[PDB]
Amino acid sequence: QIHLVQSGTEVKKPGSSVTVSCKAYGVNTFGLYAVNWVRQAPGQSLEYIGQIWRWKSSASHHFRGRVLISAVDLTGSSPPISSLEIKNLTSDDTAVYFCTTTSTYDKWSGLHHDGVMAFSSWGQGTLISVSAASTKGPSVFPLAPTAALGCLVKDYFPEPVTVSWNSGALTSGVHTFPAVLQSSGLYSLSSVVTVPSSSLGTQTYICNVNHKPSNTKVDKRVEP
Amino acid sequence: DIQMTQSPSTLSASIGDTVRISCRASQSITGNWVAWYQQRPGKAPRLLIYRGAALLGGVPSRFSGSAAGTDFTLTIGNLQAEDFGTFYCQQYDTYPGTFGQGTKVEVKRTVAAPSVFIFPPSDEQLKSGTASVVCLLNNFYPREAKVQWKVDNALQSGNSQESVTEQDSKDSTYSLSSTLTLSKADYEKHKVYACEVTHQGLSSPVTKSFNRGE
Ligand SMILES: *[C@@H]1O[C@H](CO)[C@@H](O)[C@H](O)[C@H]1NC(C)=O
Numbered sequence: 001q002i003h004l005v006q007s008g009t010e011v012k013k014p015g016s017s018v019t020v021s022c023k024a025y026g027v028n029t030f031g032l033y034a035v036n037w038v039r040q041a042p043g044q045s046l047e048y049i050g051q052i053w054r055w056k057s058s059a060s061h062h063f064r065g066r067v068l069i070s071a072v073d074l075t076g077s078s079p080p081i082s083s084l085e086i087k088n089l090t091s092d093d094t095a096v097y098f099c100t101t102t103s104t105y106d107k108w109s110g111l112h113h114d115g116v117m118a119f120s121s122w123g124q125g126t127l128i129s130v131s132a133a134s135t136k137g138p139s140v141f142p143l144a145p146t147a148a149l150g151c152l153v154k155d156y157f158p159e160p161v162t163v164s165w166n167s168g169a170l171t172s173g174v175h176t177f178p179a180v181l182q183s184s185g186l187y188s189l190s191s192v193v194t195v196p197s198s199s200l201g202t203q204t205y206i207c208n209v210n211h212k213p214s215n216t217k218v219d220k221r222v223e224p
Numbered sequence: 225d226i227q228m229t230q231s232p233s234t235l236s237a238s239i240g241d242t243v244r245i246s247c248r249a250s251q252s253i254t255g256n257w258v259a260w261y262q263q264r265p266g267k268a269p270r271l272l273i274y275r276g277a278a279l280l281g282g283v284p285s286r287f288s289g290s291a292a293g294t295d296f297t298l299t300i301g302n303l304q305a306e307d308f309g310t311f312y313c314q315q316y317d318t319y320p321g322t323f324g325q326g327t328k329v330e331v332k333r334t335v336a337a338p339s340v341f342i343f344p345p346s347d348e349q350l351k352s353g354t355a356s357v358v359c360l361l362n363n364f365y366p367r368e369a370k371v372q373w374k375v376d377n378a379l380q381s382g383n384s385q386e387s388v389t390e391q392d393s394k395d396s397t398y399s400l401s402s403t404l405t406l407s408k409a410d411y412e413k414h415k416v417y418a419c420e421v422t423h424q425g426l427s428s429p430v431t432k433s434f435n436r437g438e
Contacts, residue, residue, distance in 0.1 A: 045312065045323050045324070045325050045326050046269070046312060046314075046323045047323070048320045048321050048322070060320045061320070098268060098269075110274060110275035110278060111274055111275075112316070113255060113257050113316055113317065115319065116257070116316040116317070116318065116319050116320070116321050117316050117321070118259035118271060118274045118275075118314065118316055118321075119259075119269075119271060120271050120274075120280065122268040122269055122270065122271075123268065124267075124268055125268055139349075139352065141345075141346045141348055141349045141356070142346050142348065143343045143346070143358060144343070144346065146339070148339075148341040148360055148362065150343075150360075152346075152349070152356060152358065152403075154349075154354075154356070175362070175389055175399045177387040177388075177389060177399075177401045178387050178388075178389075179387075180385045180386075180387050180403075182385070182405075188403070189387070190358060190387075190401055190403070192360055192362075192399075192401075194339070194362060
Protein backbone atom coordinates (compact mmCIF):
# COMPACT_ATOMS: atom_id res chain seq x y z
CA GLN A 1 0.00 0.00 0.00
CA ILE A 2 1.47 3.35 -1.13
CA HIS A 3 1.74 6.18 1.35
CA LEU A 4 3.64 9.26 0.25
CA VAL A 5 5.06 11.24 3.20
CA GLN A 6 6.15 14.80 2.51
CA SER A 7 8.45 17.03 4.59
CA GLY A 8 6.89 19.57 6.98
CA THR A 9 5.68 23.17 6.59
CA GLU A 10 8.25 25.88 5.89
CA VAL A 11 8.17 29.66 6.23
CA LYS A 12 10.61 31.24 3.83
CA LYS A 13 11.95 34.74 3.09
CA PRO A 14 11.67 36.17 -0.44
CA GLY A 15 14.81 35.49 -2.52
CA SER A 16 15.53 32.38 -0.51
CA SER A 17 15.51 28.82 -1.80
CA VAL A 18 13.86 25.70 -0.33
CA THR A 19 13.90 21.89 -0.88
CA VAL A 20 10.81 19.80 -0.13
CA SER A 21 11.04 16.06 0.30
CA CYS A 22 8.83 13.03 -0.40
CA LYS A 23 9.33 9.54 1.11
CA ALA A 24 7.56 6.99 -1.08
CA TYR A 25 6.51 4.11 1.21
CA GLY A 26 5.26 1.20 -0.87
CA VAL A 27 7.21 2.30 -3.92
CA ASN A 28 9.78 -0.23 -5.11
CA THR A 29 11.96 1.86 -7.33
CA PHE A 30 11.52 5.06 -9.30
CA GLY A 31 12.56 2.91 -12.26
CA LEU A 32 8.91 1.74 -12.31
CA TYR A 33 7.01 4.77 -10.95
CA ALA A 34 7.06 8.36 -12.23
CA VAL A 35 7.07 11.29 -9.81
CA ASN A 36 5.01 14.32 -10.72
CA TRP A 37 5.03 17.48 -8.55
CA VAL A 38 1.99 19.77 -8.44
CA ARG A 39 1.06 22.87 -6.42
CA GLN A 40 -2.12 24.58 -5.24
CA ALA A 41 -2.22 28.25 -4.24
CA PRO A 42 -4.79 29.12 -1.58
CA GLY A 43 -8.30 29.02 -2.89
CA GLN A 44 -6.89 28.18 -6.30
CA SER A 45 -6.88 25.24 -8.65
CA LEU A 46 -3.97 22.91 -9.31
CA GLU A 47 -0.89 23.50 -11.45
CA TYR A 48 1.71 21.06 -12.81
CA ILE A 49 5.35 21.82 -11.97
CA GLY A 50 7.53 19.03 -13.31
CA GLN A 51 8.47 15.37 -13.20
CA ILE A 52 11.03 12.63 -12.99
CA TRP A 53 10.29 9.70 -15.28
CA ARG A 54 12.68 6.83 -16.01
CA TRP A 55 15.31 8.69 -14.06
CA LYS A 56 14.85 11.65 -16.37
CA SER A 57 13.75 14.94 -14.91
CA SER A 58 12.07 18.02 -16.43
CA ALA A 59 9.99 21.09 -15.66
CA SER A 60 7.03 22.96 -17.16
CA HIS A 61 7.64 26.23 -19.08
CA HIS A 62 6.50 28.42 -16.17
CA PHE A 63 9.11 26.86 -13.85
CA ARG A 64 12.03 25.95 -16.10
CA GLY A 65 15.38 27.25 -14.88
CA ARG A 66 14.07 27.78 -11.34
CA VAL A 67 13.38 24.23 -10.19
CA LEU A 68 15.46 21.05 -9.76
CA ILE A 69 13.72 17.71 -9.32
CA SER A 70 15.59 14.61 -8.19
CA ALA A 71 14.91 11.06 -7.02
CA VAL A 72 16.96 8.27 -5.42
CA ASP A 73 16.25 4.61 -4.62
CA LEU A 74 16.82 3.58 -1.01
CA THR A 75 16.12 0.66 1.26
CA GLY A 76 16.17 -0.39 4.90
CA SER A 77 16.40 2.79 6.89
CA SER A 78 14.40 4.69 4.27
CA PRO A 79 12.03 4.15 1.33
CA PRO A 80 12.81 5.78 -2.06
CA ILE A 81 12.83 9.58 -1.90
CA SER A 82 12.11 12.39 -4.35
CA SER A 83 12.80 16.07 -3.71
CA LEU A 84 11.86 19.43 -5.26
CA GLU A 85 14.20 22.45 -5.08
CA ILE A 86 12.81 25.90 -5.76
CA LYS A 87 15.10 28.93 -6.19
CA ASN A 88 14.39 32.67 -5.77
CA LEU A 89 11.12 32.33 -3.85
CA THR A 90 8.56 35.11 -4.18
CA SER A 91 5.03 35.69 -2.78
CA ASP A 92 3.45 33.88 -5.70
CA ASP A 93 5.29 30.71 -4.73
CA THR A 94 3.26 30.47 -1.56
CA ALA A 95 1.16 27.34 -1.95
CA VAL A 96 0.68 23.71 -1.05
CA TYR A 97 3.13 21.51 -2.94
CA PHE A 98 2.05 17.92 -3.59
CA CYS A 99 4.29 15.05 -4.52
CA THR A 100 2.54 12.47 -6.65
CA THR A 101 3.32 8.99 -8.03
CA THR A 102 1.99 6.90 -10.97
CA SER A 103 3.20 3.44 -11.99
CA THR A 104 4.72 3.35 -15.50
CA TYR A 105 5.32 -0.42 -15.55
CA ASP A 106 2.34 -1.28 -17.82
CA LYS A 107 2.47 0.57 -21.16
CA TRP A 108 -1.15 -0.31 -21.83
CA SER A 109 -2.54 1.05 -18.55
CA GLY A 110 -4.08 4.33 -19.59
CA LEU A 111 -2.76 6.24 -16.63
CA HIS A 112 -0.08 7.64 -18.88
CA HIS A 113 0.40 8.90 -22.41
CA ASP A 114 4.04 9.35 -23.48
CA GLY A 115 5.20 11.09 -20.28
CA VAL A 116 1.99 13.09 -19.72
CA MET A 117 -0.08 11.43 -17.01
CA ALA A 118 -2.80 11.19 -14.41
CA PHE A 119 -1.68 11.06 -10.80
CA SER A 120 -2.68 7.88 -8.89
CA SER A 121 -1.11 8.53 -5.43
CA TRP A 122 -0.86 11.84 -3.57
CA GLY A 123 1.12 13.05 -0.55
CA GLN A 124 -0.50 15.12 2.21
CA GLY A 125 1.09 18.25 0.78
CA THR A 126 3.56 20.68 2.24
CA LEU A 127 2.76 24.34 2.78
CA ILE A 128 5.49 26.72 1.69
CA SER A 129 4.55 30.18 2.92
CA VAL A 130 6.77 32.99 1.56
CA SER A 131 6.95 36.05 3.84
CA ALA A 132 9.30 38.52 5.54
CA ALA A 133 7.22 38.50 8.73
CA SER A 134 8.75 37.32 11.98
CA THR A 135 7.03 35.25 14.60
CA LYS A 136 4.65 37.21 16.77
CA GLY A 137 2.04 36.35 19.42
CA PRO A 138 -1.51 37.73 19.09
CA SER A 139 -3.45 40.37 20.99
CA VAL A 140 -6.86 39.12 22.13
CA PHE A 141 -9.85 41.49 22.29
CA PRO A 142 -13.38 40.87 23.65
CA LEU A 143 -16.42 41.03 21.38
CA ALA A 144 -19.02 41.96 23.99
CA PRO A 145 -22.80 41.48 23.73
CA THR A 146 -30.47 35.09 21.69
CA ALA A 147 -27.26 37.13 21.93
CA ALA A 148 -23.84 36.92 20.29
CA LEU A 149 -20.38 37.41 21.76
CA GLY A 150 -16.81 36.48 20.99
CA CYS A 151 -13.08 37.19 20.66
CA LEU A 152 -10.90 38.95 18.12
CA VAL A 153 -7.47 37.33 17.85
CA LYS A 154 -5.38 39.94 16.08
CA ASP A 155 -1.97 40.36 14.45
CA TYR A 156 -0.10 37.06 14.77
CA PHE A 157 2.45 35.05 12.78
CA PRO A 158 2.61 32.37 11.68
CA GLU A 159 -0.42 30.04 11.66
CA PRO A 160 -2.03 28.42 13.52
CA VAL A 161 -3.82 29.65 16.60
CA THR A 162 -6.35 27.47 18.38
CA VAL A 163 -9.44 28.67 20.23
CA SER A 164 -11.67 26.88 22.74
CA TRP A 165 -14.42 28.28 25.00
CA ASN A 166 -14.59 27.66 28.77
CA SER A 167 -11.74 25.17 28.55
CA GLY A 168 -13.77 23.16 26.03
CA ALA A 169 -16.99 22.89 28.04
CA LEU A 170 -18.82 25.21 25.64
CA THR A 171 -18.90 23.92 22.05
CA SER A 172 -22.52 24.26 20.89
CA GLY A 173 -23.10 27.36 18.76
CA VAL A 174 -19.40 28.17 18.49
CA HIS A 175 -18.02 29.45 15.16
CA THR A 176 -14.26 29.94 14.77
CA PHE A 177 -13.53 31.58 11.41
CA PRO A 178 -10.60 30.83 9.10
CA ALA A 179 -7.75 33.30 9.60
CA VAL A 180 -7.37 36.14 7.11
CA LEU A 181 -4.08 37.63 5.98
CA GLN A 182 -4.04 41.40 6.50
CA SER A 183 -2.18 44.04 4.49
CA SER A 184 0.43 44.06 7.25
CA GLY A 185 1.31 40.49 6.43
CA LEU A 186 0.05 39.34 9.81
CA TYR A 187 -2.99 37.12 10.41
CA SER A 188 -6.18 37.81 12.30
CA LEU A 189 -9.23 35.68 13.15
CA SER A 190 -12.30 35.87 15.26
CA SER A 191 -14.29 33.30 17.23
CA VAL A 192 -17.97 33.79 18.12
CA VAL A 193 -20.71 32.07 20.12
CA THR A 194 -24.48 32.51 20.19
CA VAL A 195 -26.15 32.17 23.59
CA PRO A 196 -29.55 32.87 25.16
CA SER A 197 -29.82 36.51 26.25
CA SER A 198 -31.19 35.41 29.63
CA SER A 199 -27.97 33.80 30.93
CA LEU A 200 -25.79 36.79 30.10
CA GLY A 201 -25.37 37.99 33.65
CA THR A 202 -25.54 34.48 35.13
CA GLN A 203 -23.06 32.61 32.99
CA THR A 204 -19.34 33.19 32.52
CA TYR A 205 -17.73 33.07 29.04
CA ILE A 206 -13.98 32.91 28.48
CA CYS A 207 -12.11 32.23 25.27
CA ASN A 208 -8.89 30.23 25.56
CA VAL A 209 -6.40 31.22 22.87
CA ASN A 210 -3.23 29.27 22.08
CA HIS A 211 -0.42 30.36 19.76
CA LYS A 212 2.28 27.73 20.07
CA PRO A 213 4.94 29.20 17.73
CA SER A 214 5.32 32.21 20.07
CA ASN A 215 4.55 30.14 23.18
CA THR A 216 1.61 32.42 23.90
CA LYS A 217 -1.47 31.40 25.85
CA VAL A 218 -4.19 33.80 26.95
CA ASP A 219 -7.53 33.38 28.70
CA LYS A 220 -9.93 36.23 28.08
CA ARG A 221 -13.14 36.78 30.03
CA VAL A 222 -15.91 38.22 27.89
CA GLU A 223 -18.30 40.47 29.83
CA PRO A 224 -21.34 42.47 28.91
CA ASP B 225 -1.49 24.38 -23.57
CA ILE B 226 -4.98 22.84 -23.54
CA GLN B 227 -7.53 24.83 -21.56
CA MET B 228 -10.14 22.97 -19.54
CA THR B 229 -13.19 25.05 -18.64
CA GLN B 230 -15.30 23.46 -15.95
CA SER B 231 -19.09 23.80 -15.41
CA PRO B 232 -20.82 24.76 -13.13
CA SER B 233 -18.71 26.50 -10.46
CA THR B 234 -20.98 25.26 -7.65
CA LEU B 235 -24.01 23.02 -7.34
CA SER B 236 -26.28 22.20 -4.45
CA ALA B 237 -27.61 18.68 -4.03
CA SER B 238 -29.23 16.23 -1.61
CA ILE B 239 -28.25 12.77 -0.43
CA GLY B 240 -29.47 10.26 -3.01
CA ASP B 241 -29.43 12.71 -5.94
CA THR B 242 -27.75 12.19 -9.28
CA VAL B 243 -25.30 14.94 -10.14
CA ARG B 244 -23.45 16.00 -13.33
CA ILE B 245 -20.26 18.05 -13.61
CA SER B 246 -18.87 18.99 -17.00
CA CYS B 247 -15.58 20.05 -18.56
CA ARG B 248 -15.00 21.45 -22.07
CA ALA B 249 -11.49 21.03 -23.51
CA SER B 250 -10.24 23.79 -25.84
CA GLN B 251 -9.15 21.04 -28.32
CA SER B 252 -10.43 17.53 -29.22
CA ILE B 253 -8.93 14.68 -27.19
CA THR B 254 -9.10 11.58 -29.37
CA GLY B 255 -7.47 9.29 -26.83
CA ASN B 256 -9.78 10.30 -24.00
CA TRP B 257 -6.82 11.27 -21.88
CA VAL B 258 -8.89 12.89 -19.13
CA ALA B 259 -9.02 12.31 -15.36
CA TRP B 260 -11.32 13.29 -12.45
CA TYR B 261 -10.32 13.95 -8.82
CA GLN B 262 -12.12 14.73 -5.54
CA GLN B 263 -10.76 17.06 -2.90
CA ARG B 264 -12.29 17.45 0.54
CA PRO B 265 -11.48 20.57 2.58
CA GLY B 266 -8.05 20.31 4.18
CA LYS B 267 -6.97 17.16 2.31
CA ALA B 268 -5.08 15.98 -0.80
CA PRO B 269 -7.02 15.26 -4.00
CA ARG B 270 -7.84 11.63 -4.85
CA LEU B 271 -8.01 10.11 -8.34
CA LEU B 272 -11.49 8.70 -9.10
CA ILE B 273 -11.61 8.10 -12.85
CA TYR B 274 -8.90 8.03 -15.56
CA ARG B 275 -8.96 7.68 -19.35
CA GLY B 276 -12.36 9.31 -19.41
CA ALA B 277 -14.32 6.34 -18.08
CA ALA B 278 -12.13 3.92 -16.15
CA LEU B 279 -12.71 3.57 -12.41
CA LEU B 280 -9.60 3.37 -10.24
CA GLY B 281 -9.37 0.45 -7.80
CA GLY B 282 -11.35 1.12 -4.65
CA VAL B 283 -13.58 3.88 -6.01
CA PRO B 284 -17.35 3.33 -5.62
CA SER B 285 -19.17 2.51 -8.85
CA ARG B 286 -21.69 5.28 -8.32
CA PHE B 287 -19.03 7.38 -10.06
CA SER B 288 -18.86 7.23 -13.88
CA GLY B 289 -17.27 9.10 -16.78
CA SER B 290 -18.60 10.09 -20.19
CA ALA B 291 -17.58 12.02 -23.31
CA ALA B 292 -19.14 13.78 -26.29
CA GLY B 293 -17.18 15.96 -28.72
CA THR B 294 -14.96 18.23 -26.64
CA ASP B 295 -17.06 17.79 -23.50
CA PHE B 296 -16.23 15.37 -20.68
CA THR B 297 -18.54 14.76 -17.75
CA LEU B 298 -18.43 13.13 -14.35
CA THR B 299 -21.73 11.64 -13.10
CA ILE B 300 -22.43 10.85 -9.44
CA GLY B 301 -25.39 8.57 -8.74
CA ASN B 302 -26.99 8.10 -5.29
CA LEU B 303 -25.15 11.01 -3.77
CA GLN B 304 -23.58 10.16 -0.45
CA ALA B 305 -22.33 12.20 2.55
CA GLU B 306 -18.62 11.58 1.88
CA ASP B 307 -19.08 12.77 -1.72
CA PHE B 308 -19.53 16.45 -0.91
CA GLY B 309 -16.50 18.63 -1.63
CA THR B 310 -14.66 19.88 -4.71
CA PHE B 311 -14.10 18.05 -8.00
CA TYR B 312 -11.46 18.69 -10.67
CA CYS B 313 -11.00 17.53 -14.27
CA GLN B 314 -7.53 17.14 -15.85
CA GLN B 315 -6.36 16.57 -19.42
CA TYR B 316 -3.14 14.59 -19.93
CA ASP B 317 -3.43 14.49 -23.70
CA THR B 318 -0.67 16.98 -24.33
CA TYR B 319 2.20 18.46 -22.36
CA PRO B 320 1.75 19.97 -19.88
CA GLY B 321 -1.25 18.35 -18.20
CA THR B 322 -3.77 20.96 -17.00
CA PHE B 323 -6.71 21.13 -14.57
CA GLY B 324 -10.19 22.68 -14.65
CA GLN B 325 -10.97 25.51 -12.18
CA GLY B 326 -13.00 23.06 -10.09
CA THR B 327 -16.60 22.41 -9.01
CA LYS B 328 -17.90 22.74 -5.43
CA VAL B 329 -20.70 20.34 -4.53
CA GLU B 330 -22.52 21.42 -1.35
CA VAL B 331 -25.65 20.34 0.61
CA LYS B 332 -29.11 21.60 -0.40
CA ARG B 333 -31.25 23.20 2.26
CA THR B 334 -34.23 25.49 2.72
CA VAL B 335 -33.55 29.25 2.69
CA ALA B 336 -32.53 30.69 6.09
CA ALA B 337 -31.90 34.39 6.62
CA PRO B 338 -28.77 35.35 8.60
CA SER B 339 -29.03 36.54 12.17
CA VAL B 340 -27.01 39.78 12.05
CA PHE B 341 -24.85 41.31 14.81
CA ILE B 342 -22.37 44.20 14.97
CA PHE B 343 -19.53 44.75 17.46
CA PRO B 344 -17.83 48.09 18.11
CA PRO B 345 -14.10 48.11 18.88
CA SER B 346 -13.43 47.18 22.51
CA ASP B 347 -11.98 49.73 24.91
CA GLU B 348 -8.92 47.51 25.21
CA GLN B 349 -8.22 47.64 21.50
CA LEU B 350 -8.83 51.37 21.33
CA LYS B 351 -6.27 51.69 24.11
CA SER B 352 -3.68 49.84 22.03
CA GLY B 353 -4.15 52.36 19.21
CA THR B 354 -6.30 50.43 16.68
CA ALA B 355 -10.02 50.00 15.93
CA SER B 356 -11.79 47.01 14.38
CA VAL B 357 -15.53 46.96 13.75
CA VAL B 358 -16.94 43.44 13.30
CA CYS B 359 -20.22 42.35 11.69
CA LEU B 360 -21.42 38.76 12.07
CA LEU B 361 -23.91 36.89 9.83
CA ASN B 362 -24.94 33.71 11.59
CA ASN B 363 -26.39 30.41 10.24
CA PHE B 364 -27.70 31.36 6.81
CA TYR B 365 -28.42 29.57 3.52
CA PRO B 366 -27.60 29.90 0.62
CA ARG B 367 -24.00 31.11 0.94
CA GLU B 368 -24.34 34.09 -1.40
CA ALA B 369 -24.31 37.29 0.66
CA LYS B 370 -23.35 40.92 0.40
CA VAL B 371 -22.29 43.12 3.25
CA GLN B 372 -21.40 46.80 2.85
CA TRP B 373 -19.87 49.12 5.43
CA LYS B 374 -20.93 52.71 5.91
CA VAL B 375 -19.49 55.32 8.25
CA ASP B 376 -21.01 58.81 8.50
CA ASN B 377 -23.06 57.39 5.54
CA ALA B 378 -19.97 56.94 3.33
CA LEU B 379 -19.46 53.64 1.47
CA GLN B 380 -16.29 51.98 2.59
CA SER B 381 -13.84 50.56 0.07
CA GLY B 382 -10.65 48.59 0.53
CA ASN B 383 -10.46 48.59 4.30
CA SER B 384 -12.45 45.48 4.96
CA GLN B 385 -12.05 41.72 4.87
CA GLU B 386 -14.46 38.77 5.09
CA SER B 387 -14.23 35.20 6.37
CA VAL B 388 -16.67 32.33 5.83
CA THR B 389 -16.98 29.02 7.67
CA GLU B 390 -17.31 25.65 5.92
CA GLN B 391 -20.85 24.39 5.48
CA ASP B 392 -21.96 23.12 8.92
CA SER B 393 -22.10 19.32 9.10
CA LYS B 394 -25.38 19.30 11.08
CA ASP B 395 -27.63 22.16 9.90
CA SER B 396 -25.94 22.76 6.53
CA THR B 397 -25.75 26.55 7.09
CA TYR B 398 -22.89 29.03 6.69
CA SER B 399 -21.64 31.78 8.97
CA LEU B 400 -19.65 34.81 7.91
CA SER B 401 -17.55 37.56 9.46
CA SER B 402 -16.72 40.98 8.03
CA THR B 403 -14.13 43.17 9.76
CA LEU B 404 -13.76 46.89 9.08
CA THR B 405 -10.37 48.25 10.16
CA LEU B 406 -9.26 51.84 10.63
CA SER B 407 -6.95 53.98 12.70
CA LYS B 408 -7.95 54.98 16.19
CA ALA B 409 -7.85 58.55 14.81
CA ASP B 410 -10.59 58.17 12.15
CA TYR B 411 -12.70 55.95 14.40
CA GLU B 412 -12.90 58.69 17.01
CA LYS B 413 -13.79 61.26 14.36
CA HIS B 414 -17.04 59.88 12.97
CA LYS B 415 -20.42 59.14 14.61
CA VAL B 416 -22.39 56.33 13.01
CA TYR B 417 -21.15 52.89 11.97
CA ALA B 418 -23.38 50.62 9.87
CA CYS B 419 -23.32 47.06 8.43
CA GLU B 420 -25.73 46.56 5.48
CA VAL B 421 -26.52 42.96 4.49
CA THR B 422 -28.38 41.66 1.47
CA HIS B 423 -29.48 38.01 1.22
CA GLN B 424 -32.21 35.97 -0.46
CA GLY B 425 -33.80 35.15 2.90
CA LEU B 426 -34.23 38.87 3.62
CA SER B 427 -37.26 40.56 2.06
CA SER B 428 -35.17 43.74 2.15
CA PRO B 429 -31.50 44.68 2.91
CA VAL B 430 -30.98 44.78 6.69
CA THR B 431 -28.87 47.42 8.41
CA LYS B 432 -27.39 46.97 11.86
CA SER B 433 -25.77 50.14 13.24
CA PHE B 434 -24.42 51.98 16.26
CA ASN B 435 -23.40 55.51 17.35
CA ARG B 436 -19.94 55.70 18.81
CA GLY B 437 -20.06 55.86 22.61
CA GLU B 438 -23.55 54.50 23.31
C1 LIG C 1 17.74 34.00 -9.23
O1 LIG C 1 18.10 33.30 -10.31
C2 LIG C 1 18.36 34.26 -11.33
C3 LIG C 1 18.22 33.53 -12.64
O2 LIG C 1 17.03 32.73 -12.58
C4 LIG C 1 19.70 34.92 -11.04
O3 LIG C 1 19.92 35.92 -12.02
C5 LIG C 1 19.66 35.57 -9.66
O4 LIG C 1 20.97 35.91 -9.19
C6 LIG C 1 18.99 34.67 -8.61
N1 LIG C 1 18.67 35.46 -7.42
C7 LIG C 1 19.20 35.21 -6.22
C8 LIG C 1 18.77 36.12 -5.11
O5 LIG C 1 19.96 34.26 -6.03
